[PDB]
Design a protein around this ligand. Structure first.
Ligand SMILES: [Zn+2]
Length: 19
DNA sequence: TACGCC
């Protein structure tokens, strides 16, 4: 539930600052 | 930034 890369919900990869 | 960054 959220971003897997950094750990910030609201995005996942595209939209992260990392991968 | 975020824009795939793989
Ligand atoms: Zn993220």
């Amino acid at each position: 539930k959220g971003c897997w890369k950094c750990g910030k919900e609201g995005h996942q990869m595209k939209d992260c600052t990392e991968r």
